[PDB]
Amino acid sequence: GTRVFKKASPNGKLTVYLGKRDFVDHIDLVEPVDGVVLVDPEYLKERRVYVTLTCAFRYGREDLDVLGLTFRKDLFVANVQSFPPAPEDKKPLTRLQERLIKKLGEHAYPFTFEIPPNLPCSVTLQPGPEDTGKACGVDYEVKAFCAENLEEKIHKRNSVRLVIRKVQYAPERPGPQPTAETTRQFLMSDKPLHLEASLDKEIYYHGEPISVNVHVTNNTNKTVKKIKISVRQYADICLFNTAQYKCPVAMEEADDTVAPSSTFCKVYTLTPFLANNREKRGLALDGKLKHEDTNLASSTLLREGEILGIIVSYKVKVKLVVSRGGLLGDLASSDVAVELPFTLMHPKPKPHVPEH
Amino acid sequence: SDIQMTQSPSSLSASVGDRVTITCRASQSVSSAVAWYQQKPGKAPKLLIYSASSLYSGVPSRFSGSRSGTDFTLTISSLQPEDFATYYCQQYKYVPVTFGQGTKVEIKRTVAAPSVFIFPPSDSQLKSGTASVVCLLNNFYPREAKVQWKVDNALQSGNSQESVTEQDSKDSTYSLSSTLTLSKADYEKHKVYACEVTHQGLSSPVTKSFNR
């Protein structure tokens, strides 16, 4: 609690300080982003200095062949006026902002930026080696600038921007142990195939083995040839039009057959991790400040209540690949699958890595 | 370039219950990515404090440290018997992670003088072609302690080794074995070889000799 993060405009007319870079979203109370902008009066002009907080969406357009091109279309923006104190926005600064005036005097004016819930966390989509431009996804940024008024122009030298990531973490208590049963009886034989699956726990931290206990109760004529185990990232993307996707991130195809009319019990352990998923351009990563190697995207925690942004989640799938033929031939699928949902995120660190 | 981490008290001695500190500087802004490690020789290192101020779990609260720009300090309030070892500062901002050269904490005691013996070389050793004679400083509170090998009022010419050991646990004192090694043909031509000590406890030089 003695280190602050500063960033100055290239021309030095605007230096922005911040207390932290990651601002935790407990689903109830979202940590606020608070800081001061130090206006060098030597390099001052009589043009208001504003500070704005933008939640936006960096996408690279698909038709435009050009590399490095990203478009930012914002979702939540806030405009805090801090050029004079003259307007009636008299607000009690924090103990962060209190120490900062003590350091820099009444030339560092404070902004008290407030982040609502029901707004997305910072989530980056993995770029191909094709891509060389800014990181695509959802990212928050605060920029401080100078202009005669808000509808005026903003010169890049008369402005400075810093990107912050809104994060989340594994709650204190865990959820129940996840478990599911989906059970197809088949057309020709009335005796059923009953799939039972469970996970050892509902909350895994990144890079931890998930172990999946599978219980098969085959009472069919049909012979389960293969068992397919997939850990599978679900991603809900809300924008002007809504688009979802289920990608897999750590799987294995086990050739454990189950006979006709035999019980089968085996537990399968699988860790997700980004290395074996590099190829999956567009998979959901966690937030990147500039370019670092972010892990697989943490689940996104939701309250009781077309919710905005990009909503990661996980479910481990358990498919049984079932013998065909006999009556309908190869025309009707016979498989039986089960999805166990679970939350995968980080622990609350009571948070950057060797950089260069 | 690489990042140099230098612990400014090369050695230090102190007592149980002191606020002693070690300092370590970095070649450039390491931005408070510094760890501190302890290590008694032979046994493995153990971790104490990460990122310069966050104390590791299972680590006693009497430990902490401080960043002042490039200069990183390690603070320990009321030390115990457990806290006696060499201490290491690491940086881990830039990829080439580095370590200080090693701050060894001594133990302050009454300045006990080293009981200096000597030993003529073995009959079985002289049967090989070379001879070695061990001067054995023993159980002394000045770590800084020197030994001047002489043979017939003339010194050594680099033909002598030295080997200090660790400070004992409850005895709390040192010991030293400086070994002058010369060929058999060179051992019997010179007349009187002798070992002279300049420890802190004993005032006058203490010399012991042998000619068999």
Binding site: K7, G68, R72, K102, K103 | -
Partner: peptide
């Protein structure tokens, strides 16, 4: 309108504070 961007500004640095 809707705005574009290029590749990777300034370097982000840190200063210290009062230990209150």
């Amino acid at each position: 309108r809707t705005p574009p961007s290029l590749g990777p500004s300034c370097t982000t640095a840190s200063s210290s504070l009062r230990k209150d």
